[PDB]
From a paper:
Here, we propose a method for generating proteins and protein complexes with complicated shapes using fusions of alpha helices. To design amino acid sequences that can stabilize the alpha helical structure of the fusion sites, we superimposed one or two turns of terminal alpha helices of connecting proteins using a molecular graphics program. Then, the amino acid residues important for forming a fused helical structure were chosen from the two natural sequences in the superimposed region. Our method does not require complicated computer calculations for the design process and can be used for the assembly of artificial protein complexes with predictable and rigid structures.
Then, the repeat modules were connected by superimposing 6 amino acids to form the repeat protein. The crystal structure again showed that the two helices had been fused into merged and extended helices with a geometry closely matching that of an ideal helix. The overall shapes of the two repeat proteins that we produced resemble the horseshoe-like shapes of natural repeat proteins. Each repeat protein family has a characteristic value for its curvature, which exhibits little variation. We have shown above that we could generate repeat proteins with a great variety of curvatures via the shared helix method by employing different repeat modules.
Numbering used by the authors: 4 to 403
The structure:
Amino acid sequence: KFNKEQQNAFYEILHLPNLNEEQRNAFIQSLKDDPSQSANLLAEAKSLNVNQAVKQLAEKAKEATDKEEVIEIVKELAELAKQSTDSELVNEIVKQLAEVAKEATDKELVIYIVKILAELAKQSTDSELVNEIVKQLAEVAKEATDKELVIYIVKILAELAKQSTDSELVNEIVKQLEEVAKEATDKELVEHIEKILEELEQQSAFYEILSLPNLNEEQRNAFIQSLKDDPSQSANLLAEAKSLNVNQAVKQLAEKAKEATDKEEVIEIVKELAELAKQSTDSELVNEIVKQLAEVAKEATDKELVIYIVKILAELAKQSTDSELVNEIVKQLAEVAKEATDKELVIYIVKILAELAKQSTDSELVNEIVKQLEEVAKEATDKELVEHIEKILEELKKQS
């Protein structure tokens, strides 16, 4: 025996128009199996009923020869996505509208549907439904054969991007217009899309440069003002900013390492710098990381941390095949050793540079290391240390 809301669920299920009989009887059977789920089944049924509804509508828009019938069907679907509030269904409706457009023989009808989708995106707070509309409009353009349809749709996407604060949507629109231009045989269509892409890319670069966290207010203002004075170089400026942004990030890590009082934290920061340099393929950034590590070692007061950093730089020199970088690490280690006041550290660095020299095939590196150690020995007033360095030097000379 049912109860009011379960019986009402029964009657409603009995009246859903876009279910076939077997789906209705399934939902009724399930309601009789467990009336406590009455709400659930009801909502489930209603969702199914509307989804098949739009499907029915879709095929009626696609079989209709009267250009007004398709306007009424598309308008009905449009009012069903707009005037309703359901997240996943509206996506299905933009996909069906898009198919109706893709198969449309009349350009006016395509323009109407595209306008409707543009208005769904413009009046939407759901980022992923705007992304889906962008995807579908973009596909309509790529498959369109009339030039005017393509121009209209890419101008629509451009206006969607120029009324947006979100950078991911601007970059996604930029990638869809890039694909449309790349698969376009018509040259003036390509040139127009590229002008649009220039404006959009300058906008996006403006937002990115504003969002970069590790530059001060004054170089960010410098970059955006140079962006205003010559927009065409939005790439050249943005690259600059990003490089500078990571550069001053590295220095900040270095400073955060210098000011840490916990050995384990300094170790973690040094691993983050080092293993950022090892996996990064930017030459001057790696250079800056090396000299920042060297400075951390230079002013560090803990023997363990100097040894750790020296070991890190050595490990970077042994696996790197960049000559200027390896000589840069060698000189950095060398002046760490010259300025260090602890014999254990001088001896360790001398052994490290010696290992590098014995590893090296290059005579410029071997003899530069040799002269570095000769300087170190020239400034040492401790006879055990000068003997140590003299042995290392004589073995290095016997090497080659």
